[PDB]
Amino acid sequence: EPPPMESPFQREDRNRFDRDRLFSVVSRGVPEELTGLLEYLRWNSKYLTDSAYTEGSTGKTCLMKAVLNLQDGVNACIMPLLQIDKDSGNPKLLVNAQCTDEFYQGHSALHIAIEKRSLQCVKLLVENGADVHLRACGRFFQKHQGTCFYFGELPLSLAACTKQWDVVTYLLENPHQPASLEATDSLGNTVLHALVMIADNSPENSALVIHMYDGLLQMGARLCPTVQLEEISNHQGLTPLKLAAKEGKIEIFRHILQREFSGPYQPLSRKFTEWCYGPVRVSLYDLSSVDSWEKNSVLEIIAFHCKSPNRHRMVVLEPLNKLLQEKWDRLVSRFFFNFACYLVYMFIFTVVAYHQPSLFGESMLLLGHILILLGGIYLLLGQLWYFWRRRLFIWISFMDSYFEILFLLQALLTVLSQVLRFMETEWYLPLLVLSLVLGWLNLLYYTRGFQHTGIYSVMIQKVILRDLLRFLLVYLVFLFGFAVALVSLSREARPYRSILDASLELFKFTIGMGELAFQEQLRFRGVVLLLLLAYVLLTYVLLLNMLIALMSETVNHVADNSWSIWKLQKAISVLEMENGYWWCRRKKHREGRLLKVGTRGPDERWCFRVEEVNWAAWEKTL
Amino acid sequence: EPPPMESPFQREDRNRFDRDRLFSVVSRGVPEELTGLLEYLRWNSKYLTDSAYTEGSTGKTCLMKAVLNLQDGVNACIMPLLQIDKDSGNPKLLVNAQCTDEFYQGHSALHIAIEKRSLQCVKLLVENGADVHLRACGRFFQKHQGTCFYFGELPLSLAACTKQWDVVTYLLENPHQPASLEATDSLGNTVLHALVMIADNSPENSALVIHMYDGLLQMGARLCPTVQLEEISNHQGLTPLKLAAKEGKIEIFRHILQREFSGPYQPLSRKFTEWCYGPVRVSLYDLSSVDSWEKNSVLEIIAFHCKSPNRHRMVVLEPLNKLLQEKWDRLVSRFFFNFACYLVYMFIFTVVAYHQPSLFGESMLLLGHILILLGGIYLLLGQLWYFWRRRLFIWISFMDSYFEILFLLQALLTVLSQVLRFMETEWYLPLLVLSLVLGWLNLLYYTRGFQHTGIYSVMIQKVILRDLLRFLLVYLVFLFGFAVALVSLSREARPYRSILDASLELFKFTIGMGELAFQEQLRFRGVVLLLLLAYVLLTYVLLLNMLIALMSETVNHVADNSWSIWKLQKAISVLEMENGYWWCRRKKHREGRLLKVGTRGPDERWCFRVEEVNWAAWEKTL
Numbered sequence A, B: 001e002p003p004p005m006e007s008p009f010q011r012e013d014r015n016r017f018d019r020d021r022l023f024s025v026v027s028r029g030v031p032e033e034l035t036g037l038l039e040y041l042r043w044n045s046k047y048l049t050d051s052a053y054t055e056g057s058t059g060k061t062c063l064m065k066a067v068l069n070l071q072d073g074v075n076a077c078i079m080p081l082l083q084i085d086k087d088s089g090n091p092k093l094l095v096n097a098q099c100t101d102e103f104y105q106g107h108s109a110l111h112i113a114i115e116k117r118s119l120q121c122v123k124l125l126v127e128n129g130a131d132v133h134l135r136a137c138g139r140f141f142q143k144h145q146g147t148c149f150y151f152g153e154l155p156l157s158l159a160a161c162t163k164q165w166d167v168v169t170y171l172l173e174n175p176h177q178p179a180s181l182e183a184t185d186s187l188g189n190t191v192l193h194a195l196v197m198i199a200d201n202s203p204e205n206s207a208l209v210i211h212m213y214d215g216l217l218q219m220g221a222r223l224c225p226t227v228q229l230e231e232i233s234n235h236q237g238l239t240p241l242k243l244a245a246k247e248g249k250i251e252i253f254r255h256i257l258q259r260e261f262s263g264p265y266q267p268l269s270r271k272f273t274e275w276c277y278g279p280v281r282v283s284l285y286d287l288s289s290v291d292s293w294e295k296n297s298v299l300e301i302i303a304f305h306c307k308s309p310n311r312h313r314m315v316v317l318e319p320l321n322k323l324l325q326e327k328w329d330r331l332v333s334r335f336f337f338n339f340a341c342y343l344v345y346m347f348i349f350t351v352v353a354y355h356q357p358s359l360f361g362e363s364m365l366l367l368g369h370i371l372i373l374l375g376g377i378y379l380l381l382g383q384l385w386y387f388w389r390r391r392l393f394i395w396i397s398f399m400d401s402y403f404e405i406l407f408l409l410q411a412l413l414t415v416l417s418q419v420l421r422f423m424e425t426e427w428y429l430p431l432l433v434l435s436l437v438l439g440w441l442n443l444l445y446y447t448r449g450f451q452h453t454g455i456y457s458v459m460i461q462k463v464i465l466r467d468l469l470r471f472l473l474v475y476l477v478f479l480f481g482f483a484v485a486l487v488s489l490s491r492e493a494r495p496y497r498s499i500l501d502a503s504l505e506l507f508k509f510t511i512g513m514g515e516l517a518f519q520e521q522l523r524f525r526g527v528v529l530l531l532l533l534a535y536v537l538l539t540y541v542l543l544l545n546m547l548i549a550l551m552s553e554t555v556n557h558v559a560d561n562s563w564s565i566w567k568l569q570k571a572i573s574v575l576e577m578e579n580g581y582w583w584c585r586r587k588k589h590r591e592g593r594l595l596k597v598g599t600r601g602p603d604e605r606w607c608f609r610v611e612e613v614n615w616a617a618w619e620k621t622l
């Protein structure tokens, strides 16, 4: 168990001016009783950095203890404690000391000074030589489940994540050791990545992150105008725009994608108003990192690399709405050509399976078996090529990619049935029939091409599968227990001869075909009737409970988001159709126009023109 | 693709003082560097109007570029640019120049000056001879789907639609070229039509339209008192009151229909308060264009020419509520006489079809066949006369006029069955039986005569048909795929012999009569049982999804509008019953009384007296 960072009740473990007297001095704050420590350290040839004066488990020095105990942001023992350290000839420094444990690794006194919101204590460390790039890489400072606080591991990133502009302003320009806006942590995250990382979708945190993101980006142009702070990638190869898309942060992603500035800081904009006429506003949006022409775009990340529930809200944002709409209109002919190629494949599949012989017409049947075999191999190779490129997509989006599983399973059992027809066995017919079911159920993937059938295919999957799958467990307990009961009691002659037959007769009560009768060919005829009556009452109550719960969870008056999920379904279809087939790869067509927008700190960007009509917003500006 | 109207990033296409130097001068605004253009134009004998100085795709001149770039509503290059144009001897003028493309056709500099809300630039063009009746008839300025802005194509209509009273006041009375309130566009729409056309049903736009409608109507009496601005019809023959009814604009239609003024502008009122006593207010409403005595009234337009979802909210407004109520009371005897004539027609239809011979009593049967034949011809001629006069009603109101289709189809198969009885064939009996079904289902049209059965017949059609019709598509895929599966697997002897028989046995599971058993006369008996079990589970889940979605879309706590839809159902019945039959045409009875209301700018109008009791509104006035 990790020890506490600061405790006025539990003393630090150990794993004349000793440590216990020293730590009590800096806690109380009076510096006059620090006399005698400098002479004691020179006599024993010891330093304040060594393990005798720090906490054994972590390495918390006396300067960290003094900073952890501040009165109105100032502690009178902080300034003189560095004087004993400097005058003792320490090869290390107390200001650059860090904890060495697994939980608070790299925690420094500058991090605690920034967290205490004491600008005076932050300044006092820098004038005495505090490194402003010291890293807190302990498990408390990583983002995980449980008790943690991720802020970007840097003093400048900590000041930005805690909303302290005076610390940020002092750390960026100071004549002793200025902080770099280009600094990174173990994840490769800069201060712009860290502001994305701390953000949830609440309005208050979103206002905090957006205000700090814009301010840091503007001060980046004043200090280091020759460096694009937005285009720095981490160790996972993600820009802050790409990192917001992967982690599903709806507010900071929308603000960066539609960033608008005027006058000064105008090259820091991704949106450019072009002309306005009444309720019509026409804008130009930057397609850098957004267009799917290049590798690992925002579109590819949202469609296949994001786990967040609000992926359908990122896809309907601007310019992602119009960019994918024009891409859909160029591929709607290819989508329906693929739909026509699957109708012919299943028209042949249905005709051949309908004319299967017992265990010209024979030549037409042999040609049909070849087309099924070649069609199965073509579908098998395409889906295997899909999972080789989309390896992590099916493990996070089973409710969004199960047709890729079903197309794979239908293709495998199609080929396997033809193998079981070459080597003559009876089992090829159940496999060919079951592939006839799975392929016909695969036509419903193509209902997303039309908006009408597409939004209907979204409203039907309201959250019913994993209620009905732990509905199954209680059901199967009721069914199995009553089934093994009925078989044992029916053995006495003076109906139910197996577990499977009794289970089928009990399942018939939920389809409206349950036989309820007073059988006279059984000794125990009252008790069987009471067991059947008890099962019917228990099942009807339990089915009634399941409706009542499904209605409490699904009729909620929350706005119907079936339009957005349908747009996400097309965006997956477009981004896969833009890669072509496995045998033929389509070339990538870039979107937008190369336009000059000003001067870089010329400034040529690939801009997408968006025409938007909004009568509501225009009337409020009158 | 149309080029942008104004772009600081994309230069205008081309489809010494050249165009590129000239367009940069008027964009920046300094007029001192315009020197040399007048001498250059006289040397080359060129003008500013020609295509060398305008955009090739559209025809955007330099004056349009100068107006598109205004600083605080004024550009210093606008006034001197007209001096080079005037001094060069141009047969045309730069102020009356218009774009020639398909998208911005007829766009002038006066339109941009009004849209920029610069009264100084609007004035400066008129003193130099800007035509105030120039027309913007391009596709951007027509009302359609996509990016557009319809305002009435006129400078006065543009100023009225953008809420600029100072531009409207200046354009109507100016000593150079005043604007006419009687001016029209290609649709025939005046400024009063255009204010109706731009209005949606939001409260903010409705307040904007009503305020501009009343103000323009009052200034019409001051400027041109001898012209009725409200009675001008467009090329579709619609007054602004009629145009609001056809496009379903609930707010501006109610305000015009119940317009009340006092003192001055009192002849501009359609409602006149007659006497008040406590909570009782008695008013007189103008029946001009409203009463169905004349052709193409508001009642005829609302019932048969409107596509808007809120047609039932226009019919319950005043005086439309009391006018149709008194018309219903004069026709409720004719409605029930028509109901009694259809009961006798179907009492004969049921008796004759019940006594059909094999393939006095014979004379009574022959008389019954004649009455069915004559009754079928009478119903066929009436419905064919209906669709000759109501040609566009059945194509926009299928959920409101399908009984006219069903009465037509029942009459056709009635006559066709008698034809197939004259030429002796066996197929007349299925047609006569199916006409017996369709005629009995046609009695439910007459349930709207009673309020009780009428409002019930409205609550039952909550929106369930087109959910259950794209519910059908997924269903039919499940049913057909499992049906062709079961037939193929049942061919091995050691049930389901056709697609139709298997489809019927699978459909029986949704009516509670599905047979689930372990058949021992089939080789593949486990796999058939698993296929049946999979079909039952898939169908039950999918039926459960359809209930959950129907309940999420229909129990919404929105107020029940079944009373208003029932009133719209009677209004269609009254307006069709007022035309009489096809053989006999009833004369039209005018409503209201001819009363003098003042002096026209005597003033005799056909006024409808409405007595209204409202205790709630009276108590707030105390």
Ligand SMILES: CCCCCCCCCC(=O)OC[C@H](COP(=O)([O-])OCCN)OC(=O)CCCCCCCCC
Pocket (backbone or CB within 6 Å): A337, A338, A339, A340, A341, A342, A343, A344, A345, A374, A375, A378, A379, A382, A403, A404, A407, A445, A581, A583
């Ligand atoms: C190898 C070079 C020759 C190629 C042969 C011609 C193939 C045409 C390409 C094609 O249209 O395939 C469409 C379809 C793929 O479905 P999907 O991957 O889009 O959907 C995936 C969803 N997860 O594939 C099918 O539906 C089955 C294709 C086999 C039958 C072809 C019949 C042709 C009729 C003209």
Ligand SMILES: CCCCCCCCCC(=O)OC[C@H](COP(=O)([O-])OCCN)OC(=O)CCCCCCCCC
Pocket (backbone or CB within 6 Å): A399, A400, A401, A402, A403, A441, A444, A445, A448, A457, A458, A460, A461, B474, B538, B541, B542, B545
């Ligand atoms: C291993 C064998 C498994 C066989 C399972 C066969 C299931 C077929 C898939 C199916 O039911 O059709 C899905 C259809 C459209 O879904 P979608 O494209 O919107 O979605 C695609 C991306 N989400 O929408 C529906 O019809 C759903 C209504 C029925 C639900 C049945 C639940 C299936 C599990 C019991």
Ligand SMILES: CCCCCCCCCC(=O)OC[C@H](COP(=O)([O-])OCCN)OC(=O)CCCCCCCCC
Pocket (backbone or CB within 6 Å): B337, B338, B339, B340, B341, B342, B343, B344, B345, B374, B375, B378, B379, B382, B403, B404, B407, B445, B581, B583
């Ligand atoms: C040609 C000159 C002689 C005319 C013959 C007498 C016809 C009376 C007119 C009449 O009442 O017709 C009522 C009904 C029409 O229904 P609908 O158009 O109102 O509803 C239309 C809704 N879409 O029509 C019927 O129900 C069927 C009429 C045929 C049987 C008449 C039986 C008479 C019993 C007294």
Ligand SMILES: CCCCCCCCCC(=O)OC[C@H](COP(=O)([O-])OCCN)OC(=O)CCCCCCCCC
Pocket (backbone or CB within 6 Å): B399, B400, B401, B402, B403, B441, B444, B445, B448, B457, B458, B460, B461
């Ligand atoms: C080509 C052959 C087609 C035969 C279709 C037969 C349908 C008969 C019409 C009917 O069902 O009765 C309608 C009844 C009253 O409707 P309405 O007068 O309020 O409305 C008149 C103006 N809206 O209200 C109801 O009873 C509705 C409840 C049943 C709905 C059945 C849906 C029919 C399609 C499957």
